[PDB]
């Protein structure tokens, strides 16, 4: 039995999603797994999407201030994990920020900053503690979500790609695959080891925060690990000489003013890496290090505006700088 390498990529969930697999299984089995990966992404776009009228999440948001809504176990679990990171991060990551994000989402389209009072009003409808998750303990009991605060809106943009990368890994493993690189718009999961007959760690690239995005500035060698990056120049618009990026500080209702250009989180679960990358970007370097002490199983890599790079002890020896303008502090 020979090793073969496969990849497939499609535009779905608003970005380019690519999965690369090495396998000795019959090619038909790999093709079937990849078919299911991309069917899953299509289906989940219709569950999780914040910017569509026909998604399950949009239906949930339409019931804010009303009765609990039945959701499937998967969406319930994702919301539970999102609220966990909201609590642990002091709301730096906030999955109920839709009232504010939606104003900024039209801002992007219109290239215009939201009004002050409108923005001040939106911040009053973002209390994630008023998302009530309930699930009965008896056999087959439904899972429900209630948005108790009038006009509050869920937006899972900062955790959905991580969730989907984890769901894809679970699917690949269900198909008896153990070597893959999952890349959902840059949200990476490195499953197992790649092939060279030699088995090698995956060399995951981290971009220059200001890069055209072509070349990575650094690579990190990893196995069975998600690598998720949140950064200041990945999505933004400009107006009158000021840049407004897409990661909001919930305290100000404005794009976060932070001391790092990007934060990359390395974790066994991409859900966790995605939520933490957002929280850490909002919190800034020192407070991020404090938060991360609560998660011993994760590592982090910070790129500063002066091109210094700091990486935690669990990954620093695995980092290689490719763009010599950057310096890895040791």
Ligand X SMILES: Nc1ncnc2c1ncn2[C@@H]1O[C@H](COP(=O)(O)OP(=O)(O)O)[C@@H](O)[C@H]1O
Which residues form the interface with ligand X (CB under 6 A)?
Answer: 93-95, 97, 101, 155, 157-158, 161, 230, 234, 246-248, 250, 274, 277-278, 282
Helix then strand then coil, in percent of the chain rounded to 5, is 35, 30, 35
212 is in an annotated binding site: no
Give me the DSSP letters along 274-294.
HHHHHHHHHH-HHHHHHHHTT
Paired strand residues for 236: 245
203 is in an annotated binding site: no
Among the residue ranges 120-128, 246-254, 273-281, 282-290, the one whose residues contact Mg ion (CB under 5 A): 273-281
- Report d(CA 286, CA 142) in Å as an integer: 41
Whether the Cβ atoms of residue 308 and residue 327 lie closer than 8 Å to each other: yes
Among the residue ranges 50-58, 153-161, 188-196, 202-210, the one whose residues contact Mg ion (CB under 5 A): 153-161
Decide if residue 158 touches Mg ion (CB under 5 A): yes
13 is in an annotated binding site: no
Q: Single out the residue of 49, 38, 50 nearest to residue 8, CA to CA.
A: 38
CB of 34 to Mg ion, least distance (A): 23
158 is in an annotated binding site: yes
313 is in an annotated binding site: no
Paired strand residues for 226: 189, 267
Among the residue ranges 90-98, 127-135, 168-176, 186-194, the one whose residues contact Na ion (CB under 5 A): 186-194
Residue 246's binding partner out of Mg ion, Na ion, ligand X, none, with CB under 5 to 8 Å set by partner kind: ligand X
- Report d(CA 142, CA 73) in Å as an integer: 8
CB of 179 to ligand X, least distance (A): 25
Decide if residue 278 touches Mg ion (CB under 5 A): yes
CB of 100 to ligand X, least distance (A): 8
The Cα-based distances of 96 to 18, 131, 265 in angstroms read 29, 8, 22
Among the residue ranges 80-88, 103-111, 185-193, 217-225, the one whose residues contact Na ion (CB under 5 A): 185-193
Decide if residue 257 touches Na ion (CB under 5 A): yes
Residue 94's binding partner out of Mg ion, ligand X, Na ion, none, with CB under 5 to 8 Å set by partner kind: ligand X
* Residue 212, SS3 per DSSP: coil
Q: Which is nearer to Na ion, 239 or 257 (CB)?
A: 257
Any idea which residue has 């999965």 for tokens? Answer: 19
C-alpha torsion 147→166→184→143, nearest 10 = -20
Q: Which is nearer to ligand X, 30 or 159 (CB)?
A: 159
- Report d(CA 42, CA 53) in Å as an integer: 15
- Report d(CA 318, CA 306) in Å as an integer: 22
Residue 209's binding partner out of Mg ion, ligand X, Na ion, none, with CB under 5 to 8 Å set by partner kind: none
Whether the Cβ atoms of residue 303 and residue 260 lie closer than 8 Å to each other: yes
- Scanning residues 203 to 242, which ones bind Na ion (CB under 5 A)? 229
Which residues here bind Na ion, judged by CB under 5 A?
Answer: 186, 229, 257-258
Binding site for Mg ion (CB under 5 A): 158, 274, 277-278
């Amino acid at each position: 039995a020979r090793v073969r390498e496969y990849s497939r990529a499609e535009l779905v969930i608003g970005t380019l999603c690519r999965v690369r697999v090495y396998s000795k299984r019959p090619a038909a089995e790999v093709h079937a797994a990849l078919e299911e990966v991309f069917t899953l992404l299509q289906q989940q776009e219709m569950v999780l999407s914040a910017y569509r009228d026909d998604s399950a999440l949009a239906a949930l948001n339409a019931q804010a201030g009303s009765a609990p809504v039945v959701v499937d176990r998967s969406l319930y679990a994702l919301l539970e994990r999102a609220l966990f990171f909201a609590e642990k991060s002091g709301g730096a990551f906030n999955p109920a920020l839709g009232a504010v994000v939606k104003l900024w989402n039209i801002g992007f389209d219109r290239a215009a900053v939201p009004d002050p009072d409108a923005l001040k009003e939106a911040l009053t409808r973002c209390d994630f503690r008023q998302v009530h998750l309930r699930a009965g303990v008896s056999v087959g009991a439904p899972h429900t979500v209630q948005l108790a605060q009038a006009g509050m809106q869920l937006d899972l943009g900062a955790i959905a790609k991580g969730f989907l990368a984890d769901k894809i890994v679970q699917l690949l493993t269900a198909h008896a695959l153990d070597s893959a690189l999952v890349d959902l718009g840059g949200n990476i999961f490195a499953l197992g080891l790649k092939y060279g007959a030699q088995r090698l760690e995956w060399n995951v690239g981290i971009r220059d925060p200001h890069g055209t995005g072509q070349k990575p500035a650094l690579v990190v060698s990893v196995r069975d690990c998600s690598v998720v990056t949140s950064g200041a120049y990945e999505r933004f618009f400009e107006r009158d000489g000021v840049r407004y990026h897409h990661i909001i500080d919930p305290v100000t209702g404005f794009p976060a003013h932070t001391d790092v250009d990007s934060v990359s989180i390395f974790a066994p679960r991409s859900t966790d890496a995605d939520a933490l990358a957002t929280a850490c970007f909002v919190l800034g370097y020192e407070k991020s290090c404090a938060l991360l002490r609560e998660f011993p199983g994760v590592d982090a890599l910070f790129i500063f505006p002066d091109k210094r790079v700091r990486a935690s002890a669990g990954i620093v020896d695995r980092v290689r700088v490719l763009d010599a303008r950057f310096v890895l502090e040791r």
